[PDB]
């Protein structure tokens, strides 16, 4: 029963009921169904036309909000000393939603999701006072974010010839500009992303339980196109992801215990009464006590 | 050219904006959408599903012992069994539900809730309970005569081992807000108490103590508004293996 | 009327005296992969009444120290019957999995089992940062057992497990739970040896209790594929 519903449902006037054999208050939880009882059948009600909408709770309203997915800083200095490996005026990042608990827990209320992600890169720069205390100014640096599909050879350095971006989707943006915004389509080999995977990736026995290679959108490489200046800077790049055209299937319980890792659904639980393993809900004195009840 | 005026709020990145953005992958054909069972279009579909509450949220109860209320045969008449603070958006027996978890993502809520209680004693055990709901004003009732004055239901354990107490929408405003873990006029919902109507009579071969599981859902009247950040989750640092995602 | 139920699938049959109006997962009945949804351009085998015949797993004893039991599908029945043979000899499958959980106890017993079917129940290890292994997740027909059923062994609440296709076995009212499942996968077909579509968890919420002689109380589960079909057809492995 599709039944397009735009606002909440109204109530009707109720009268004294004494009919026997029909009992609306009694039901069967044993059946795996929710009680099909109206407020009319339990108490004596009045006619109430309800004008409260239901749009704020739509799944595309619930999920389509630009949430932080990554936050990584790197130096804009001249890297001569043999250190800072894989982070020398560039960084890479495998796009995953399981790194910041807000968007992760929100997306993990559904078993499958189908959306067109919209990425937004927000860049800030800051001078280094490593050997001094002098602020000379902030430069207008252009950055390049190349979207490398997962399983493809990413740029190993920032001077490499892999940045020419023959077919790879690339974007160039200055720090002074508005944040760079692009759209990634629903690029999954299946009809919906698998937020939860109950299998192993490959045929070999040890195949990284829980991680589906199809769910991984790709790989995001970010460098500074400019050459280094006589002084050093620290460039922080924040990525924001906003799902669009969302479809969601098979809702799930929300995560209660704190997340332990980005790879797996492991749990440890907090120490004290709230969100521990023994106790999820904070304790109270007894069942017949009120945590804070009015006393005048 | 067209003479253009730059308004305030141009260039700003509002994380709740709704605009079209640049296609990164041109002429991409998304996978044909198959039919998967269980599609959710509104989050108010999954608040209307019953879910156990932890009325026994005490220290002595650990794990699944917190999800049932052990009632016993009493020797004094008109005896209180338990009470449930109806705080739907602050820490309490209703915090870890489906309606409660979905509601802690929003500030304002409306509509009426339904409490369902299933009896998990033996078939040979009989009894009668009275589940009361008192509107927000005043203290929690401790005797049955003062608690019967609110909307209640008298329940007789029979073949139908589940009853429904409905908490009607009783408010002056259209909505209720969270605003704190506080006792405020536009935040409180009232109390739910359970007394013994007659007793829990049980034969000798049956177990003397019989548990009682309570469920809580939302009606069609329910509504939520002013979405926010849920407090049920939070991190103080980066999760494990998050640095491996950068290499 | 709604307490007497008979399920006839192939040459197998189940007759129940205390039923509870069997449920359907998400209001869906299994089907046969229509021509528009199908991607594998190859004639599938549809062995009916050879598979789709109510295979019965080994019973488990319900006690006081019991936390819960789970079986992953089709991992549980990947080695029994002609279903297991077709699963081995073929590369892809698509099945229905009608479930029936039997549990009996006298009128002086009290108890409650939450018989829930979780889709894609990716479970996590407790108190460690390492991911679960193969012999930890893949238990076969013996299934596993919950050690923290409070959090369903994934960090998510058990209280909210009634959002999944579920039924209860309240000993005072019914003694059986029957759940019908659809395909429920983002893919039209899947490799059965690595991935599990469903997870049948039986968590005793109210512990079994009686002041009688306390005789043994087993819990029996009967799985039945529905509208199962296979593609592939290479050697056994």
């Amino acid at each position: 029963i599709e039944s397009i519903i735009k606002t909440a449902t109204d109530t009707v006037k109720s009268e004294i009921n004494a009919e026997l054999g029909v009992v609306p208050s009694l039901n069967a939880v044993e059946t795996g169904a929710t009680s099909n009882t109206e407020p009319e059948e339990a108490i004596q009600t009045r006619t109430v036309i309800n004008q409260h909408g239901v749009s704020e709770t739509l799944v595309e309203n619930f999920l389509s909000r630009a949430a932080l997915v990554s936050k990584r800083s790197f130096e804009y200095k001249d890297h001569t000393s043999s250190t800072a490996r894989a982070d020398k005026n560039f960084f890479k990042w495998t796009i995953n939603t399981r790194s910041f608990v807000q968007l992760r827990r929100k997306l993990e209320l559904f078993t499958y999701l189908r959306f067109d992600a919209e990425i937004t890169i927000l860049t800030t720069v800051a001078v280094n006072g490593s050997g001094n205390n002098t602020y000379v100014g902030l430069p207008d640096l252009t950055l390049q974010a190349m979207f490398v599909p997962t399983g493809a050879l990413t740029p190993e350095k920032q001077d490499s010839f892999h940045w020419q971006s023959g077919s790879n989707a690339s974007v160039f943006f200055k720090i002074s500009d508005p944040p760079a915004r692009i759209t990634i389509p629903f690029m999954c080999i299946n009809s919906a992303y698998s937020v939860f995977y109950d299998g192993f990736a490959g045929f070999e026995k040890n195949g990284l339980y829980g991680i589906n290679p199809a769910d991984t959108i790709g790989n995001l490489c970010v460098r500074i196109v400019n050459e280094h200046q006589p002084v050093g800077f620290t460039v922080t790049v924040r990525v924001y992801m906003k799902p669009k055209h969302i479809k969601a299937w098979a809702p799930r319980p929300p995560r209660t215990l704190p997340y332990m890792s980005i790879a797996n659904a492991n749990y440890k639980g907090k120490e004290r009464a709230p969100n521990a393993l023994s106790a999820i809900i904070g304790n109270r004195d007894s069942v017949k006590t009120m945590p804070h009840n009015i006393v005048n | 050219g067209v003479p253009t005026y730059l308004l305030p709020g141009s260039g700003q990145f509002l994380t709740t904006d709704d605009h079209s953005s640049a296609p990164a992958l041109p002429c991409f054909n998304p996978t044909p959408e198959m039919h998967i069972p269980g599609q959710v279009r509104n989050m108010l579909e999954v608040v209307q599903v019953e879910s156990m509450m932890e009325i026994n949220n005490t220290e002595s109860a650990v794990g699944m012992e917190r999800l049932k209320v052990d009632i016993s045969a009493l020797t004094d008449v008109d005896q209180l069994l338990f009470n449930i603070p109806l705080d739907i958006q602050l820490d309490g027996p209703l915090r870890n539900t489906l309606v409660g978890n979905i509601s802690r993502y929003y500030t304002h809520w409306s509509g009426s809730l339904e409490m369902t209680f299933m009896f998990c004693g033996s078939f040979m055990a009989a009894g009668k309970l009275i589940l009361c709901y008192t509107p927000p004003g005043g203290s929690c009732p401790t005797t049955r005569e003062t608690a019967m004055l609110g909307t209640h239901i008298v329940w007789d354990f029979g073949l139908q081992s589940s009853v429904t107490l409905i908490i009607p929408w009783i408010s002056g405003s259209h909505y209720r807000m969270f605003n704190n873990d506080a006792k405020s006029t536009n935040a409180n919902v009232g109390y739910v108490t359970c007394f013994m109507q007659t007793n829990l009579i049980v034969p000798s071969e049956s177990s003397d103590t019989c548990s009682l599981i309570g469920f809580i859902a939302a009606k069609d009247d329910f509504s939520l508004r002013l979405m926010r950040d849920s407090p049920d989750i939070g991190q103080l640092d980066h999760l494990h293996a998050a640095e491996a995602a950068y290499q | 009327s709604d307490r007497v139920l008979q399920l006839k699938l192939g040459n197998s049959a189940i007759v129940t005296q205390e039923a509870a109006n069997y449920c359907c997962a998400y209001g869906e009945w299994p089907n046969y992969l229509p021509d528009h949804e199908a991607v594998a351009i190859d004639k599938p085998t549809q062995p009916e009444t050879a598979t789709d015949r109510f295979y019965t797993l080994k019973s488990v004893k319900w006690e006081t120290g019991s936390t819960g039991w789970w079986w992953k599908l089709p991992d549980a029945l990947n080695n029994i019957g002609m279903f297991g043979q077709n699963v081995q000899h073929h590369y892809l499958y698509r099945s229905g999995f009608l479930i029936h959980v039997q549990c009996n106890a006298t009128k002086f017993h009290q108890g409650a089992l939450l018989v829930v079917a979780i889709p894609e129940h990716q479970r996590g290890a407790h108190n460690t940062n390492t991911s679960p292994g193969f012999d930890d997740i893949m238990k076969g027909e013996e299934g596993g057992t919950f050690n923290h059923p409070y959090v369903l062994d994934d960090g998510t609440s058990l209280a909210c497990a009634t959002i999944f296709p579920h039924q209860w076995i309240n000993l005072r009212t019914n003694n059986s739970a029957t759940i019908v499942l659809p395909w429920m996968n983002a893919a039209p077909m899947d490799f059965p040896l690595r991935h599990n579509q469903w997870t049948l968890a039986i968590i005793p919420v109210v512990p079994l209790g009686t002041r009688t002689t306390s005789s043994m109380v087993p819990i029996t589960v009967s799985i039945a594929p529905m509208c199962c079909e296979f593609n592939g057809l290479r050697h056994a492995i």
């Binding site: 169904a33 595309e60 | 709704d18 296609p23 041109p26 069972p37 579909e45 209307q48 | 069997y22 209001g27």
Partner: peptide, 28 residues
């Protein structure tokens, strides 16, 4: 207001008011 050729780049759709709750409240 969509000026791109690819359809997936459009703005979010906020007009799907066709929810069916009996999938979960009455799963029979």
């Amino acid at each position: 207001i969509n000026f791109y050729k690819d359809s997936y780049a459009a703005s979010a759709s906020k007009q799907d008011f066709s929810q069916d709750p009996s999938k979960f409240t009455e799963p029979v």
